[PDB]
Subunit: 350 residues, 2 copies
């Protein structure tokens, strides 16, 4: 079986009033956790990979992890999405490696750290949209710079994130910039900046409506009722796993993530893709620390790494269920990328 386009999945999510978690993958245990969770609740899958993931795993290994997933779970539609593409050339290479969706992150320059001009962003993103749609491949773009609205800090997602203190206007997407950007690029999915950031250290206190601007998601959805919105940096940071990490030799200070309740509110207002990485890292590290402490004579990696599969799988299950994904995989009839390309050429997805 083949991969599905992200545009098909996000269209179905909007039609049926749900939103999909998009999980980062780096190795076998992470891929098994994602697929086993999706299979259990019969949910569609978006799996994504960063440039850091390619460096760690190797491009052939990432490609073949997804091919194995589709073979073992043939009834589960799978998108393979390239996160934080630094340039059109990067996105073109990802298409050649078999990705069905790419993010051209034109909100930063090719260094993945310097905020870009509007014109640079549109030029790079429009370029990727044109050559991706010719192949049926979906494109996510970003307008606004991810970062914390109180501190001006973005954090780092596998080396990607603004360097230096950001201004309020940089980190909060204006409604009209979102409108102009969609008109100018034709992206399939729009990442916006509303106060989330990469990593575990998103908020020093439980986020308020002033620092996590769900109200701005509502405003953008009112202006762009048909645009699928992407929430980056939207791990919830499970306090129960922070507790386990701190109990078994780790040290993570008091910090909070994006609450599931607020993500669900975003889904009611057009969020169809919710990027989650840090939560799986925290669940994995808590599970390994606890197993090693409780089983000092066990040296089979499958024993403690098996605990990371189960811990990550429970995160994924929780998110699929809370975001409305149960049973939706059985409703989707996959469209080939060649057919998607034909639909783009006819203007049916404008």
């Amino acid at each position: 079986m083949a991969l599905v386009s992200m545009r098909q999945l996000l269209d179905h999510a909007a039609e049926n009033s749900y939103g999909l978690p998009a999980f980062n993958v780096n190795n076998l245990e992470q891929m098994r956790a994602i697929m086993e969770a999706a299979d259990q609740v019969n949910a569609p899958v978006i799996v994504q990979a960063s440039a850091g993931a390619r460096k760690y795993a190797g491009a052939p290994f990432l490609r073949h992890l997804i091919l194995a997933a589709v073979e073992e779970f043939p009834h589960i539609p799978v998108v393979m999405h390239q996160d934080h593409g630094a340039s059109p050339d990067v996105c073109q290479r990802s298409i050649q490696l078999g990705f069905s969706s790419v993010m051209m992150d034109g909100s930063l320059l090719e260094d993945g750290k310097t905020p870009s001009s509007y014109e640079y962003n549109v030029n790079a993103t429009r370029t990727v949209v044109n050559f991706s749609h010719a192949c049926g491949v979906s494109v996510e773009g970003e307008i606004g710079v991810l970062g914390n609205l109180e501190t001006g800090e973005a954090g780092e997602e596998d080396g990607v994130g603004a360097a230096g203190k950001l201004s309020h206007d940089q980190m909060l997407t204006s409604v009209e910039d979102a409108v102009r950007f969609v008109k100018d690029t034709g992206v399939d999915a729009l990442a916006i900046a509303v106060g989330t950031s990469h990593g575990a250290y998103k908020f020093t206190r439980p986020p308020t409506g002033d620092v996590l601007r769900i109200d701005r998601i509502k405003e953008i959805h009112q202006a762009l009722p048909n645009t699928h919105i992407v929430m980056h940096g939207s791990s919830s940071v499970p306090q129960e796993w922070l507790k386990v990490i701190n109990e078994y030799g780790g040290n993570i200070g008091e910090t909070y993530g994006v609450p599931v309740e607020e993500i669900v509110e975003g889904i009611k207002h057009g969020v169809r893709k919710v990027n989650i990485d840090t939560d799986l890292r925290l669940a994995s590290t808590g599970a390994v620390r606890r197993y090693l402490a409780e089983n000092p004579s066990d040296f089979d990696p499958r024993k403690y790494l098996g605990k990371t599969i189960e811990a990550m799988k429970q995160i994924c299950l929780d998110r699929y269920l809370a975001f409305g994904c149960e049973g939706q995989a059985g409703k989707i009839k996959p469209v080939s990328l060649e057919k998607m390309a034909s639909r783009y050429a006819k203007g049916e997805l404008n």
Copy 2:
């Protein structure tokens, strides 16, 4: 590029007076460690998987890990070998999944625990040889029951290993039984029992010539000068990694493995395949325990799992170099399995 047969690699090892380590694989980090080591020293690769590995990783994932390895390292010939096949049906399924070599472990019944009769063993093994050679697939068989000659205990390799106390005669392959078994089966590789066993707890003291019968390998090689011998249970158990595990929250008592020096002596007398699993598990667990202790705030699995890649890679490098494998990959012109099947049919590999 395709997989190579194990018979081709073992023939080349005998022609050039070296022996190959055969590493068990269960996930991405293990596969990368093996391939990066082999690429660094330009050595051929035997990677093997147990039934326990299939249960843990999934058969499509194991298959695609090997496909990714061949794609990223196209100049490194790779065998994918099914370890401890419990029945002809299991070995047939492994061929269907794309293995280029299988072990029919007829020394135990299908439960993987009850020692078999000679006739059962020959019947199962001959059956697998006939249908494997018709496809060009290599076959390893075993005569003699693995286990410790002083204690009568075999240990467990992913659930495989004799149950109950074994007799001296069961655990030490006689020369004439090896001769009869090769004549009766036509295997490509012969596993024998000379005092090794699965796992870390092979010997309570550094092994002597009485408990690790390298002299019997010499005797069997004198009787069967053209038979490629397989040493199971031949991890060395690195004392430096035991020290690290014990320093960082683990507890492994005093125990010893098979010394590299004795394995090299075996290679001089016909050992061409040396099975190693436990050493990679020990290197992995020591590396993760140390990293977690030294970096309490780090929760990115790639950081501590990356240390397992490097630790396992160093084991593999050490073994490839010590066993004579450096540079040998560049000398091998791969033969397709279809051509191997033709050679078998013409009697050229009898």
